[PDB]
XYZ file of N, CA, C and O in Angstrom:
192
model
N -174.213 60.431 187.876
C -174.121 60.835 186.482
C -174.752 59.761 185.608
O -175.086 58.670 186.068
N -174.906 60.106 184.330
C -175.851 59.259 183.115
C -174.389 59.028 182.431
O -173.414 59.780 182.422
N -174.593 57.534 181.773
C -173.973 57.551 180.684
C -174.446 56.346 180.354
O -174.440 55.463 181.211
N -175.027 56.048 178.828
C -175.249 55.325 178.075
C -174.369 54.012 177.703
O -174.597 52.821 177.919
N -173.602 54.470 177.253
C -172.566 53.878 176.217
C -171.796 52.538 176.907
O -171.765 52.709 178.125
N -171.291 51.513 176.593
C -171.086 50.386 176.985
C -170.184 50.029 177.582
O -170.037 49.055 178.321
N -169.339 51.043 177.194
C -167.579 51.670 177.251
C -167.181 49.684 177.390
O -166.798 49.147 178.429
N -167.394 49.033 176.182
C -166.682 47.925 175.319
C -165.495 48.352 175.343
O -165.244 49.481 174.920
N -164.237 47.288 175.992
C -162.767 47.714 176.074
C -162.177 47.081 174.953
O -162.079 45.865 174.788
N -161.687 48.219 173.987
C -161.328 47.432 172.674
C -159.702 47.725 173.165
O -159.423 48.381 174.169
N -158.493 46.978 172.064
C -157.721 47.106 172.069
C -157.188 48.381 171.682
O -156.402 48.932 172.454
N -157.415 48.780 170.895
C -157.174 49.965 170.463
C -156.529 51.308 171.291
O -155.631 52.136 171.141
N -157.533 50.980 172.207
C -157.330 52.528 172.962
C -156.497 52.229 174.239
O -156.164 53.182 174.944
N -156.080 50.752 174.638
C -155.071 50.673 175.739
C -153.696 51.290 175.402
O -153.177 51.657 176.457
N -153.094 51.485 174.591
C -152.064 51.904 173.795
C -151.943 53.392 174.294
O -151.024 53.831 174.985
N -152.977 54.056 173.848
C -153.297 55.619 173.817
C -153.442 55.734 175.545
O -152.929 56.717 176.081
N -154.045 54.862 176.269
C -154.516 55.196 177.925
C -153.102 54.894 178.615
O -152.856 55.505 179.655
N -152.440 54.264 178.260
C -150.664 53.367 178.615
C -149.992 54.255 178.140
O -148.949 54.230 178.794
N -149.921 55.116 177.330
C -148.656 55.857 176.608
C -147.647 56.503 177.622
O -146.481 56.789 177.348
N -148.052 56.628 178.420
C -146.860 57.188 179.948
C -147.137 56.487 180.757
O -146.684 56.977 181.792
N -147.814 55.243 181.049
C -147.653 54.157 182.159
C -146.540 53.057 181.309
O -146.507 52.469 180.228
N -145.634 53.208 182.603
C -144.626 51.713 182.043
C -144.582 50.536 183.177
O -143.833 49.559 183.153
N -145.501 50.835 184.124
C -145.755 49.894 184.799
C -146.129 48.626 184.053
O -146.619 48.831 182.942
N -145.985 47.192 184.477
C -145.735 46.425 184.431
C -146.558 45.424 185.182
O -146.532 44.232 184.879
N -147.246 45.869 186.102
C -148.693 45.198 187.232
C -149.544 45.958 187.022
O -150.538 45.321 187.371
N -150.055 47.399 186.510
C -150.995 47.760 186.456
C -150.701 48.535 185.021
O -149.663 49.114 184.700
N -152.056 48.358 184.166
C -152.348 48.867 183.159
C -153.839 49.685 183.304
O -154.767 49.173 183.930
N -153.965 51.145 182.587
C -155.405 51.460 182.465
C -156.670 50.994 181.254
O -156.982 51.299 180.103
N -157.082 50.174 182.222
C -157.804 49.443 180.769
C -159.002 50.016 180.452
O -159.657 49.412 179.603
N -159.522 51.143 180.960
C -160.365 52.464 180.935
C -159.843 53.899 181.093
O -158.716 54.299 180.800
N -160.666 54.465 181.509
C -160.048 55.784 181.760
C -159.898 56.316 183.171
O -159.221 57.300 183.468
N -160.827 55.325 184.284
C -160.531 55.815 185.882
C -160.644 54.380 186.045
O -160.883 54.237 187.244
N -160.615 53.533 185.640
C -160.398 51.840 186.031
C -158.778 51.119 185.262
O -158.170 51.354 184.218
N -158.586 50.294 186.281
C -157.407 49.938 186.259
C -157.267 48.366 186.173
O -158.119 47.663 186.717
N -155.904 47.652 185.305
C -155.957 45.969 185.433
C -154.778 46.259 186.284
O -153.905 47.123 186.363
N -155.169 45.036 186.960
C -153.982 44.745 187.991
C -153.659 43.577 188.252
O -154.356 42.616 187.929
N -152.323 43.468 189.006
C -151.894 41.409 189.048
C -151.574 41.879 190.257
O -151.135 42.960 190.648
N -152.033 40.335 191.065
C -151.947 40.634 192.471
C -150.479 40.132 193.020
O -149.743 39.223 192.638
N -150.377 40.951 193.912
C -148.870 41.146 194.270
C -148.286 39.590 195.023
O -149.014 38.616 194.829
N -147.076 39.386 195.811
C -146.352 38.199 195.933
C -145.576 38.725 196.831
O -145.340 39.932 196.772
N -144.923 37.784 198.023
C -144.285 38.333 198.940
C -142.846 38.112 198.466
O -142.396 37.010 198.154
N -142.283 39.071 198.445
C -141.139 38.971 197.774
C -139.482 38.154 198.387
O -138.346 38.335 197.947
N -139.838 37.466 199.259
C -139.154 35.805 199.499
C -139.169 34.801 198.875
O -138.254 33.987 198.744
N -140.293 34.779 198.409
C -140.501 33.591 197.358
C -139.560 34.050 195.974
O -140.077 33.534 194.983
N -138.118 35.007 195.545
C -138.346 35.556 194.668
C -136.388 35.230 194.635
O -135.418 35.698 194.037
N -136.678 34.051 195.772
C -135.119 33.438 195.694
C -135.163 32.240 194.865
O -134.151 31.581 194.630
N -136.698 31.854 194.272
C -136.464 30.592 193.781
C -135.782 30.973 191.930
O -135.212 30.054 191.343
N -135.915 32.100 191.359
C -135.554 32.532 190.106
C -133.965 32.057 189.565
O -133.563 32.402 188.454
């Protein structure tokens, strides 16, 4: 497919792409692309 446009990730529109994600490690910071934090083995999670 063609597409021009720069698709520049403004703030704006994470709000509107998040509105039913309440995840917490992954956010859509596009519209088929995703931010993510990389995961941790969850032993290490006695030091808290």
């Amino acid at each position: 497919a063609e597409v021009d446009g720069d698709q520049r990730i403004l703030i704006r529109s994470l709000d509107y792409l998040n509105n039913d994600i309440f995840s917490l490690s992954r956010i859509k910071v596009g519209l088929d692309e995703f931010a993510t934090i990389k995961k941790a083995h969850f032993s290490k999670m006695v030091s808290f």
